[PDB]
Design an enzyme around this catalytic site. Sequence first.
Site, mmCIF file in Angstrom:
data_model
loop_
_atom_site.group_PDB
_atom_site.id
_atom_site.type_symbol
_atom_site.label_atom_id
_atom_site.label_comp_id
_atom_site.label_asym_id
_atom_site.label_seq_id
_atom_site.Cartn_x
_atom_site.Cartn_y
_atom_site.Cartn_z
ATOM 1 N N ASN B 9 -32.619 5.720 -25.688
ATOM 2 C CA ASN B 9 -33.402 6.661 -26.043
ATOM 3 C C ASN B 9 -33.069 7.199 -27.635
ATOM 4 O OD1 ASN B 9 -35.303 9.073 -26.542
ATOM 5 N ND2 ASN B 9 -34.538 10.131 -24.811
ATOM 6 N N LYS B 11 -33.919 9.507 -29.504
ATOM 7 C CA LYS B 11 -34.329 10.899 -29.818
ATOM 8 C C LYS B 11 -34.684 11.093 -30.872
ATOM 9 C CE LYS B 11 -31.509 12.388 -25.538
ATOM 10 N NZ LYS B 11 -30.859 13.395 -24.912
ATOM 11 N N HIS B 93 -39.381 13.845 -19.894
ATOM 12 C CA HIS B 93 -38.011 13.749 -20.227
ATOM 13 C C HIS B 93 -37.612 15.245 -20.206
ATOM 14 C CE1 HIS B 93 -34.265 13.885 -22.662
ATOM 15 N NE2 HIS B 93 -34.312 12.299 -22.442
ATOM 16 N N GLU B 95 -35.948 17.044 -22.092
ATOM 17 C CA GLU B 95 -36.171 17.834 -23.366
ATOM 18 C C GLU B 95 -37.690 18.193 -23.383
ATOM 19 O OE1 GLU B 95 -34.452 15.111 -25.637
ATOM 20 O OE2 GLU B 95 -32.230 15.857 -24.945
ATOM 21 N N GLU B 163 -32.107 12.539 -14.433
ATOM 22 C CA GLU B 163 -31.262 13.508 -15.333
ATOM 23 C C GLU B 163 -30.541 14.664 -14.603
ATOM 24 O OE1 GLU B 163 -33.242 13.669 -19.267
ATOM 25 O OE2 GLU B 163 -34.864 13.737 -18.053
ATOM 26 N N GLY B 169 -25.146 20.370 -21.327
ATOM 27 C CA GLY B 169 -24.964 21.524 -21.692
ATOM 28 C C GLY B 169 -24.647 22.860 -21.057
ATOM 29 N N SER B 209 -24.637 11.663 -18.678
ATOM 30 C CA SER B 209 -23.707 11.187 -19.653
ATOM 31 C C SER B 209 -23.030 9.885 -19.230
ATOM 32 C CB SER B 209 -22.552 12.136 -19.806
ATOM 33 O OG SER B 209 -21.429 11.633 -20.867
HETATM 34 O O1 LIG Z 1 -33.138 20.160 -22.081
HETATM 35 P P1 LIG Z 1 -31.489 19.996 -21.601
HETATM 36 O O2 LIG Z 1 -31.408 18.637 -20.987
HETATM 37 O O3 LIG Z 1 -30.604 20.023 -22.812
HETATM 38 O O4 LIG Z 1 -31.381 21.068 -20.561
HETATM 39 C C1 LIG Z 1 -32.140 22.155 -20.392
HETATM 40 C C2 LIG Z 1 -32.103 23.264 -19.217
HETATM 41 O O5 LIG Z 1 -33.039 23.459 -18.339
HETATM 42 C C3 LIG Z 1 -31.558 24.561 -19.907
HETATM 43 O O6 LIG Z 1 -32.649 25.531 -19.587
#
Ligand SMILES: O=P(O)(O)OC[C@H](O)CO
Lengths: 246, 246
Positions: B9, B11, B93, B95, B163, B169, B209
């Site tokens: 991906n 991105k 995904h 994100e 995921e 993060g 990761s």
């Molecule tokens: O979208 P990520 O993978 O960077 O993590 C999102 C978490 O739900 C933080 O709200």
Amino acid sequence: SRKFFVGGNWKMNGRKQSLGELIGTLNAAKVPADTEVVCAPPTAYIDFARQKLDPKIAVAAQNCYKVTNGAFTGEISPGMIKDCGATWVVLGHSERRHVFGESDELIGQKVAHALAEGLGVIACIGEKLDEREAGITEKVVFEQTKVIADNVKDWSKVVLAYEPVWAIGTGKTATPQQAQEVHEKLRGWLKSNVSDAVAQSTRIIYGGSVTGATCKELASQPDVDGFLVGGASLKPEFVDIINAKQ
Amino acid sequence: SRKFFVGGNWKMNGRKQSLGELIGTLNAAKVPADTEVVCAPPTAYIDFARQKLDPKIAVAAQNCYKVTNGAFTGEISPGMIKDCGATWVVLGHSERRHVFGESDELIGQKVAHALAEGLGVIACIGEKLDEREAGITEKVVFEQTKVIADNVKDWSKVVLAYEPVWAIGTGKTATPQQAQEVHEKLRGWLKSNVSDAVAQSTRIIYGGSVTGATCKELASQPDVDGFLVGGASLKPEFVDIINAKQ
Ligand SMILES: O=P(O)(O)OC[C@H](O)CO
Ligand SMILES: O=P(O)(O)OC[C@H](O)CO
Ligand SMILES: [Br-]
Ligand SMILES: [Br-]
């Protein structure tokens, strides 16, 4: 005087065969003097469309994100838009705000980044039905315009598009007078909060319903400087809208 | 046995020059036997990437919408993805869910439409930090997987990607054992709620990761069937991940 500006937002429509046909029709149109035409293809076709459109017509992306690269699956950046040969982006469109939840804060950040990277921006504003009914049209569109203006360093790169969201999919009809009234208020906002020069030079285009049969009357409104056209932009009728001042 | 599946991906990263270079490196890699490789470029580059990648590697869109055409500025449809030569889409995904607010309901509707239109889907699931800490990993990922499964007619067209959002993060590290534990629970969900055959044949790939130094150990987990790779997918290291079972 302000150059008449006609954008065609193809939204999520088209495939290569039918977009190539549409582009043939647009390439063959005679763009009148002091008229600026921009077309916004679906993101998968930005490069394709720029290759097939004559340079007399500019290409816009329909959206972008607020940094140049990163972990944002499904997004594109201004740098990618430029790399595909496009020179504009539409930001803040009512579908992004009200179907996809994009906040004013995010839209302002996108405006700042797209402009810094050298794109022009068609920045969209507009109030919803409940906002109109509550009497807060001015408060809403002034706050939206303030966020945009707070992220503009060079107003020559910006066009404002008023979308009467309250009159799109609600059963309400926006009259040309109602459109003109909001455009005048927005221009007065620019005069009072940016400068008289910016107010006089910035195009404020109408993003409500427009067809070949209504475009002349809308374009004749003194503070309506063109259109951000939706569905008619996919049809030969778009050429008549290009000629709305003729 | 389940064919090992490695998705890259990209991105929101790349321009034509650097993506062409990346594609040269991938084209030159020797894909081992019973290994399926898919790359997901930014939307503005789907067509470009498909033209330059050898057919041994498939192309995925990073997202799509849930109808074939319409008034959805900034979106693309499965029909457009296919028209650009891609054969997969990534849906759900993390994100999209957690930066862009996409709901389970919407993701299920996208899955149904993309599959009906003939695409393969890499369908992504995963729990956030607060969900993990509350002990509801299973409840969350089972509900996400149920929505996906409720919109699948042909499981041969689907790959599931777990995921560990709680470990992206947040300061938390997901161990290979913790990944394996969730993959086993997901496979048990498929056995109990779809069928044993679907459970045994469906690839469940890891979307946390992964690097060249960790990919062998992750790939050796019995219920980890490959990877949906983020940042390493932009680098020659991705070829080592393709070879994680070697
Ligand atoms: O979208 P990520 O993978 O960077 O993590 C999102 C978490 O739900 C933080 O709200
Ligand atoms: O996105 P529109 O232009 O179709 O209208 C959105 C309204 O806010 C309905 O909530
Ligand atoms: Br079509
Ligand atoms: Br770059």
